[PDB]
């Protein structure tokens, strides 16, 4: 735990989010679910900025107190949150990360429940099944880091495993079951 | 996936090139004011309940859409270094 | 794969999305599930069982007179089952293949869905022989079908493997990507940056494998070949199959 | 790419074992060390379990059965290479057949160094790549050879000095660095002062251990010694390479931070002419 | 409800006390139930006789031992963090060499814990457990030589850990070797020390083993009797005087080293049985008259030349063989540690004689609880053996209550050498459940004991077995030893029977641990029941006989992680042990004797026994579980009700009517949905969450103590340095929060001063239920030093199954809960009644666990027949019988449809139409029969509900038994953005008002590096961590709507530069062309 | 040394390796699935199947091992029971007749027409070296029965 071997072993990061995982049938591979509670807190800063562009609050700290504690989160607030992300995309990460796709980019969208909704196709990617596991979620604050995040880290852009020219968006069990019982 | 992402990769000589290009123009769009676009007339990005996504949606979302059209030009040494923020800040409020 | 190489990235996605939906959609209306009776046991059961029953007694009647050695009786019997089991296997598949081409359990395996032949055996058919604590597989096979009530001991035997399996999976997942670590420690500074190297030094990639059964050059398996040529840079152009 | 190689291979690593019972009359438990362990030894120049002595000499074959220790000669031009293999050893090469340098006399595993001297560098490398795959292949692992190749490449990225010309004959420098000389040896500066170099095979670890940049050495190896000797001379650490450039926290030499695209122009006609209007 | 069990086998003797493993073990260990008159021996007493007779002249021996006056009652100790001990007194007198004195004054030494009714312990406010341990019964054993197939090697190991490891290796080059403390020497030498003379030796020794010349060799040294000892010492590495310092030697006399184990079994066993015969003494002792007699060396070697030659009886002992593997129950473990303190106590009394002030001392002068008490407290709280009592629910604790492990004192089993013991051995049969081991690492190292299987006088787990004369079955049985078992031929309990005689001629039986077929003539014994084969943990699975041992192992442990749901429901199918479980488990309370019901109060139960007496019972309303859960007792009786001795008074945490109920039996319709049940995903109808089916009670114990710093002691009070009143409302009392208050994340429960008030940690809290403080005037509490006072806050809330919920089945099918579709568009049965839970069939194949498929069908009939079933492990119900009853059910489901005035539905047509095309139904038959015949398969028509269009193809349905696990979504819900920072380094760690962002690790980075996300990466290594400048700089830009800051130089960069400068290192930052570069 | 086999015995053994290749290849395939099957750590299917690999991986060795250093016998002529001869034992007192053909330890298979006994087998031990007219016994669990070599053909 010295100085040279410090910048390597990395450490803890901000805007971090994680929780029990579940499949997201309706969800498109182009996106990824995400608990409203999380996204909201995991976006306090950004949110506040947009809160200003709207008569929600007079100034920064104004909006901070607006929701400093509210069991009645204004309906306007929510609509704004979504209005904050828009294009911006976050990142997903399985605990045991060994391959690059151990982390893929997704376009979050308001969802119910307290667990994170994840697309079934990437289940194969991040070695994980829906028995109770839990992924991680980061957010490219840097409008520059946001680029490469959806340009070269977006899921829909990573299909051909670098390990082998074998497809990654390979349909699994259920999908197959049907596609076969029909043909 | 993302809008004509393929058409993009085909315009660049390297995957990573695109990224750096999308990011640089993305900033110039917000810092130097949000009126540097070139496709503002029609087919301009829109929102939902209120198509107010005609002014300030998302940086990159616009950047790429700009490259969608061969209106812009890029390269290694196109325009002088410093002569960058000088000709931009004076041309745009 | 073809789609991607044809239309393009994004487009592929849409396909995938479309598929996903329909897949599920039908997987619900199809009306397929699992029932105790869906694990149809081929009638050949009682047949082969006997065919192998008196069969074993034959080899036994031999050793009882000193015909075979102590070791032969072992390898001999093993051969019986090892193969007699292979029979029942293909047998079951056949019964489903002709009579119930839509039988749940079955459809699964065949389809790119779940289920594996070897596994199916341990259901419709029956598990073969287990292994002893030492290493050498047991002598008394598992004449019981999963679909049927497996006798006590036979279960006690089928556990010798369950414990063993959870043993190796504890010494290989402990180090957690230890390899990658050491591996990265030398590939962490290797990246692309240039415009075509000038080194005209080609590489000799074998299309045929040396000896397997006497000095005879054979054609390497399909996979290996690709793993070595798929996506490369042909040094010297070569017109072979008539194509340039 | 580096990371690639590393990942593609790392992932599998956590799924390779094997070593049981069905054999046992001597010290044999599998016939070699098939499993992940083999991977180690391969990535690390070692002397395998069932090392097969090779014949650096290329000739014919002659055997002598039974009696104490069996022997096989690789006679040819005139001299006869004798190899004493216990009667409990098994070989594939038969009497007469012509053998080449670095050929598997005994059945089993080969030796890195040995193969190197006998046949040569090219042989070793090809041996490695294939030797690896074999493992992952017999495990249902389908990974492109590309990666494996990159790895071994560094296991040879270093050679030793034979003939002086600027540095002692007891040193091992980067293979590329040798060209830095091979060129300035006759081209730039005349007076051809050859520097017979001999590629040295090193296992993955040992390789990194002899890295050029000090920044990197300051991580793994004993910091003290590193900085210490690195100080004496005004060591120049070119900030190229994830690892080292990582410590500094600066933008990694690869990806978007690559020196190739790190500098990009995003001009708009509306202002492009504005640059012309400033002349 | 009706109850039908398919018990074909006549289960003779019922299941013994599932807790007797811990029960008697403690009892017999410390003979206290009966006066010192009933002079037992073993354990406590034996411990005395051991190191009590002390003589240095110091002459003090043991007289009587008594005690057992627990300072505070049970609960008290729990809540007061007190230790449930017991004052230990002792009566002993002293006699001098100079006739006189008989000073016997009550001398006590420390207190000792006691075993709870359930069989647990309350060390310090918490309930722990004393798990058993295995090993190799310290005895004589012969096993082949290491890597040399040559001869063999003998081994002797007499514990405790203070017993030398002696070995006998036959060195071929000549002479035999005796390994001790890493050194070999000519055994001859020692033999001579024993009196063995050359002649008498060889003759009665190598009379058959010509190899004798390998020891009858010494003709130079072996010519000196007693002198030999002098030489033997010379062997000892130390350079001490060759005088009478026969120390090390005497050490192996009759004192401690040689195991002082019971003179008859413990040691004699490995003796008489294996080799030699009678056991002179208790071990290889006898150091009287100068010479030494050891009827141990003669045999150990007599057995050596035996196997190395002829065939005295093939003596090649086996390792793993349980018939040589002893267990370490609580009593042994405890009594063991006890002897330690004793030896440490005697340590003093001895020294307190050399410096003794004449005959003016005896009690205190020679006693001190210090050594004794210290030991005991070390074992019950510092030994890895004792653990946190797993009370996730009734069952859980029970298992952890009788589990066993190898690892321990070390002198039995290590950690890096046991891939051999980890695997199930032949002897484990009915001794150790082969599917009771935990998952992950250590698997096999730890595994509970079988069922009926019980410990004996000394470890050796015996097992019941049916006696049989010829072909007649005896109703008598005896617990056979893992050893003597192989001696006979045992047959299965499957074996058909005709009253009391064997059936078929070709009967199955296990000879010597080997499966064989024997005739009804060589039937020496027979299995008592399929149960004794596995442990309870598994004897709870429905149709085990239809699931793999691997997947079974899963469901087995899963039951232990079950959560005490509020609405308990006994499994539609039961193994018949649920009644016994809840009993020996002590989850519920039974009536002591027969009588009648008195007071049936929700908090107290009173009754009047027929023997003319009245007693009440405390009804622990809602006690805080060790794993945070409910532990209530629902009174299942009413005022005035004749009750029988041992009747269900109030239900346990997960019990219901004397039957275990860890979960609920909900309707299930196994079939693939809209992908909502992908991998292991599990759909669910809102209908269930409506009638509060799957839900539980959770608690949170947040404690706070009033420290006492030297900078002004902290005071508890409503005094808040931030004049906040909007938070002092609920804080009524002077510091503590009101009872029944609704605390929320962030509010204060207790107010500290110096403002270090204990706030509501992240997440939630729930509603307070009970709290207690501890002022200075300690009524009798051991207030930790530096502490002025202490307070506890018991908060709780309801756990209503939501989304992140996960639940599995007794068969091992685990899975999360995806979407919870409402009963509206929920697949329904043609006649209303929609489904409840939708499982995906894909999880059935690969996972060979058909058992479920069975319980379902069986349950499908129990719904209409309105009844529950009990199927023995392997003697359980069979396919035939089921179809019978199930059919009967059809005459109820559809039987009513008829009389009501309605037939089949147009929809039911199309389905059956494809049914026939699927070979499910026999064509030509009438719709009526077609549906019936189809119902018998366990599949029925089913409408979508979403579109009303039924799903073509019947869908097997039934009532499967599931359950929620400990792992909730509460302990997982980290959502951070801006908060605290590492006071030391510079990391976004939270803990209070905010949270802390998960780590990134080099692994994740690498992958990130691969992508080439230079900036995304650099962003994580700086702007989101170390360099605090760019962090805030970034916060501003964001709140200002400006592009995030682009760090020019991470604080790590410049800091290191100068950090090196600090010591020589002239770190010079040059540019692209060897030029200076300003760093700051 | 040098394994001795016959044309018939060869065809059966060589072909054996060919069958095993079609099976073994199926084993690898199954894994390529299980590994992609998701479900971590206990694919009940994974491990059992892994060992199964070692079993085929092993049979592949024993097979190819002998096949590279064996011999071929044409003992159609001669009187003394040699490698390839078909002897016929007839219990003296019983009057019952039998037929068999002992061969090297690499041919054991009770299934063949004449019960092919191992060369190093007790039965294979008492036959080599004697001719038409011999009568000897060995050790038998039920006792010890002698047999007279009726006739040695081919
Ligand atoms: Mg999981």
From Swiss-Prot, chain A:
Q: Which residues bind Mg(2+)?
A: 129, 131, 133
Signal sequence residues: none
Q: Highest taxon of the source?
A: Bacteria
Q: What does this protein do?
A: DNA-dependent RNA polymerase catalyzes the transcription of DNA into RNA using the four ribonucleoside triphosphates as substrates.
Per the record, the similarity remark reads: Belongs to the RNA polymerase beta' chain family.
Its assembly, as annotated, is: The RNAP catalytic core consists of 2 alpha, 1 beta, 1 beta' and 1 omega subunit. When a sigma factor is associated with the core the holoenzyme is formed, which can initiate transcription.
UniProt protein name: DNA-directed RNA polymerase subunit beta'
Whichever gene encodes this chain, its name is rpoC
Which part of the entire sequence is included in the shown chain?
A: 611 to 793 of 1524
Curated annotation (Swiss-Prot), chain B:
Keywords in alphabetical order: DNA-directed RNA polymerase, Nucleotidyltransferase, Transcription, Transferase
User: Can you tell which superkingdom this protein's organism belongs to?
Assistant: Bacteria
What are this entry's molecular-function GO terms? Answer: DNA binding; DNA-directed RNA polymerase activity
- Please name the InterPro entries in this protein's record: DNA-dir_RNA_pol_omega, Pol_omega/Rpo6/RPB6, RPB6/omega-like_sf
The UniProt entry's GO CC annotations, sorted and at most eight, read: DNA-directed RNA polymerase complex
Q: Gene3D superfamilies given for it?
A: 3.90.940.10
Keyword Nucleotidyltransferase present in the record's keywords: the answer is: yes
| GO biological process, any | DNA-templated transcription
Q: Which reaction does it catalyse?
A: RNA(n) + a ribonucleoside 5'-triphosphate = RNA(n+1) + diphosphate
Catalytic activity, EC: 2.7.7.6
- Please explain the role this protein plays, according to its UniProt record: Promotes RNA polymerase assembly. Latches the N- and C-terminal regions of the beta' subunit thereby facilitating its interaction with the beta and alpha subunits.
Instruction: Fetch the NCBIfam families from UniProt.
Output: rpoZ
Which family is it part of?
Belongs to the RNA polymerase subunit omega family.
What interactions and quaternary structure are annotated? The RNAP catalytic core consists of 2 alpha, 1 beta, 1 beta' and 1 omega subunit. When a sigma factor is associated with the core the holoenzyme is formed, which can initiate transcription.
The name on file for this protein is: DNA-directed RNA polymerase subunit omega
Species, as recorded: Thermus thermophilus (strain ATCC 27634 / DSM 579 / HB8)
- What are the leading ranks of the lineage? Bacteria, Thermotogati, Deinococcota, Deinococci, Thermales
Q: What gene makes this protein?
A: rpoZ
From Swiss-Prot, chain E:
Q: Name one GO molecular function term.
A: ribonucleoside binding
Fetch the Pfam families from UniProt: RNA_pol_Rpb2_1 (PF04563), RNA_pol_Rpb2_2 (PF04561), RNA_pol_Rpb2_3 (PF04565), RNA_pol_Rpb2_45 (PF10385), RNA_pol_Rpb2_6 (PF00562), RNA_pol_Rpb2_7 (PF04560)
Q: Which UniProt keywords are given for this protein, alphabetically ordered?
A: DNA-directed RNA polymerase, Nucleotidyltransferase, Transcription, Transferase
Record's Gene Ontology CC terms? Answer: DNA-directed RNA polymerase complex
Task: Tell me which positions the record assigns to the signal sequence.
Answer: none
Question: What CDD domains does the database record attribute to this sequence?
Answer: RNA_pol_B_RPB2 (cd00653)
Reaction catalyzed: RNA(n) + a ribonucleoside 5'-triphosphate = RNA(n+1) + diphosphate
Q: What EC designation does it have?
A: 2.7.7.6
Gene3D superfamilies from the entry? 2.40.50.100, 2.40.50.150, 3.90.1100.10, DNA-directed RNA polymerase, beta subunit, external 1 domain, DNA-directed RNA polymerase, subunit 2, domain 6, RNA polymerase alpha subunit dimerisation domain, RNA polymerase Rpb2, domain 2
| One GO BP | DNA-templated transcription
What this protein is reported to do is described as: DNA-dependent RNA polymerase catalyzes the transcription of DNA into RNA using the four ribonucleoside triphosphates as substrates.
Please state which protein family the record places this protein in: Belongs to the RNA polymerase beta chain family.
Quote the subunit structure annotation: The RNAP catalytic core consists of 2 alpha, 1 beta, 1 beta' and 1 omega subunit. When a sigma factor is associated with the core the holoenzyme is formed, which can initiate transcription.
Name recorded for this polypeptide: DNA-directed RNA polymerase subunit beta
Q: Which organism is it from?
A: Thermus thermophilus (strain ATCC 27634 / DSM 579 / HB8)
